Amino acid sequence: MSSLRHAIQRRAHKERAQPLERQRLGILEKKKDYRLRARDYKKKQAVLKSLRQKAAERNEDEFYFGMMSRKGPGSALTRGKGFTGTVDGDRGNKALSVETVRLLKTQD
Amino acid sequence: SLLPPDNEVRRKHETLLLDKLYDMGILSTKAKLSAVEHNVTVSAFARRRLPVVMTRLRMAETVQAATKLIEQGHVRVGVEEVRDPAFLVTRNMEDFVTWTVGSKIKQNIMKYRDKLDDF
Amino acid sequence: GTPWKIFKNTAFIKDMFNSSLEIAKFEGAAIRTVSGIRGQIKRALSKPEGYFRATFEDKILLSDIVILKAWYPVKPKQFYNPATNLIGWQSMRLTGEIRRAENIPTPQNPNSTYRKIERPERHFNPLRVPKNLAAELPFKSQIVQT
Amino acid sequence: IEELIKRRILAGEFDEVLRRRPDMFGNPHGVRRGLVADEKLRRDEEEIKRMWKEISAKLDALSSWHY
Amino acid sequence: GSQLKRLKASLREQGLIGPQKSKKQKRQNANDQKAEALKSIREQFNPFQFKTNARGPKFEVTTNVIKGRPELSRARSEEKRRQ
Amino acid sequence: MLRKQARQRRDYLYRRALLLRDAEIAEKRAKLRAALASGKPLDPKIANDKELRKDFDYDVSRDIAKEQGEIDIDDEYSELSGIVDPRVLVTTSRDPSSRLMAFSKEIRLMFPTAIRLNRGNLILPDLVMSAQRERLSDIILLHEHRGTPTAITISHFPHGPTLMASLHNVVLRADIPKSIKGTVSESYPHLIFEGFRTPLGQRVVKILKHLFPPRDPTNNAKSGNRVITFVNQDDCIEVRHHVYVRTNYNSVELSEVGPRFTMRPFSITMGTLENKDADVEWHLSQYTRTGRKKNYF
RNA sequence: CGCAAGGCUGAAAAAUUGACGGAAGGGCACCACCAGGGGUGGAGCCUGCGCGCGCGCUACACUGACAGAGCCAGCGAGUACUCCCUUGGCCGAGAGGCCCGGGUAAACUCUGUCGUGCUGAGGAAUCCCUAGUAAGCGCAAGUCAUCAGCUUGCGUUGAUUACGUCCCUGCCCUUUGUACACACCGCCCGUCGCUACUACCGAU
Asked: What is the CB neighbour count within 10 angstroms for residue A70?
């Protein structure tokens, strides 16, 4: 049980460190750090597998009405060197009319 | 059901009825007659209609917009344009419903994807 | 041993053996990482003499240490003093008395003495979606990055 | 392995899939296409055949002759 | 020719597979070897027991083709390791 | 066409999930039918379910048909089992060697209806595309190490399973001279399978015996002169290819005509060769504790 | 617990449906013909299979070398990746960390400078190959089996010659069935078995 064990039965076992001749390579990854690494990789691969399923089973004739108010991801040919697959969003700025810029420049 | 269970014509017409309903897309399985007991349903027919099946295929966004688009006549099923919003799309014509020839909705999709070929 | 080149699963492991004869003896052996990743010695490596290819369970890191746990037999020594006390007898000393008498310090390895390990909190990089997949997936699930 | 092959060949049992007729369902007797109470159960079977003729006509006409 | 056809032809030559002879034909056979030839047939028509090259010899010298038995050699080596 | 392949694969996966739930219910319904015929008392949780009785009255007959074996299970092979001759093409890896191309020819000649295709510069999704575009039943890919083949990939189409296996002890047809070998007879081969007993063994038996065209069942027990043998020990299926004459009613002379393998499968995926992200059905569990003790198939 | 669990013994048929062929006529095949192409086999290296054998890799010159100019890809992102080992010196009571030494393409296009100079493209055989195929080229990955002496992808450049015929070598099949009109064909052949009946021969 738990009362049938001495304090030397309860005593913790210490963890060894990376050798000092090899400490420049980083920390020695043990089971806990390996579990963190494996959890992050399995999570990222699960998201990527779901994205690959969604890109495979895509209707080529789909029509949402946000397509008339968004700029598409395009291709590398149409966009150019600045091509990421992400749809570009708006930063909030807008082209500003001349009367309001006349007001702002009088204030400045 | 009321026929005896080891009957040849019962077994043959069970397979015929289940295959016919699964080919029309009403049932989702073809291995139970309780599907025709409590799964065949006027809502199953009405969701095999055309604006709901293109809502599911994401040709439109909502069934209201889909009924508006197939009343304006952008949607063909196969090779023939469909103006009736009650055309029951079966399971093998859900692979052939698409936009019409000179469609402005098709130009909108191609203009979004930046593949607007004007030829 | 120590990893030399690390691919997705197969890692080349360097400072463990000295020759392809020793690797051919220890072919198929259950090799293990300190972290817990299992693996198997697959094939001796030709051009650096003493390295080998071992296919692991998942990707190991260059900081890791790759161990192989063999069991070497130990035979006891066949020494026998009688403790003839009424006649007289030579008593073999203990190792502490030997070290204090003939003045040799006890062997102590600094890599073996336990230390406190400063672990930084593990933060990982965000998800990096490829460009072709990110341009091919549909509108409801398209990535929006300003 | 050679003796296993010889035993199967001699007391010949082979695990090849056999060519079945494509119309085993509708034509189970395999007739040739050239020159050629229980009454309650028979009446029930004929009623189901009549019902299925009507219902199959209605379902094919409602799917608009894609079937 | 095929292996099937040459096997049938060699067994017809050795008289193991031919037509059902009458008692008069058996009288002629008892009026007028085959295991020694059947050993050669069962060795020749099962050529994968032993390792052979396909090209034949590279340079023909004339002076007066099974080059190894891998099955028998592997069984012999395993018996040596058992011992 | 491609939308139809995707739609039919999705319908197949949904029907398989519904079959899982319906099997969980139909294990309870078979106790009610056996208790009705034999009169042994059954569990109260089964006998007091009104939905189960009300639906049991309609779904007797498929359980009786499955007991008699009159119907066949929902499978990717049961649609076209003995109706169509399965066409199958054998291909190499990208830049094959001469012994890999001769081995590809040899295992083409193993199947009487197969064809061989030169890879050259052929992207693997377009290979899958051309297979579905020409309605092939099976593709088989080959991988060599250095003039000796080390892997097969048997993929069933339109959406069927892959079996990837590694080859060992390959003795080619192209090593023995033409005086001793000859042109292999192309008759429809008999098949024998020895040692497959698990449902996974019957799975690999199905995806291996639906590569061959169906034999005419009128007099197949005595006619036909060519046999192909798949026999497994320690889940490494070993395959021979013999040709035989029946030299008497009690004896038979065999003659080894084709290549010898002992292929070991390491991956059976419910999805074709292009899908690297398909859900696996079985894979060779190395680096586990008792994965070497446990024998599958 | 009961049965299984007592040795005329001493290793190496079926057939009215069967056994084997022949002749004629078809179909197919880069394991066939025909037209071409490409390997291997010559020298060296080495995995593998049993000193030998092939499979890859490398070298072998007109398709040249040197210097410039211009212009092209696709698959690839796990807080993860590193080629050794050392002469010295720094800061190091000691273990270490430093510094300085030693061992997004190839291709292609255009323009010039020099000119065959151990500075030599593989015999008999044997095998493979018919369109984005043969062949050249690089780049990337290393996915529970296999694979670094390599494997598998990915793009780039992209031909000649067949695409006919069963004449050779073969393989499969017809001569029974499986549908009916027009239309055409018109009892394929041999050696035996088995069964039924008939009479014969000679011992008991």
From this structure: 17
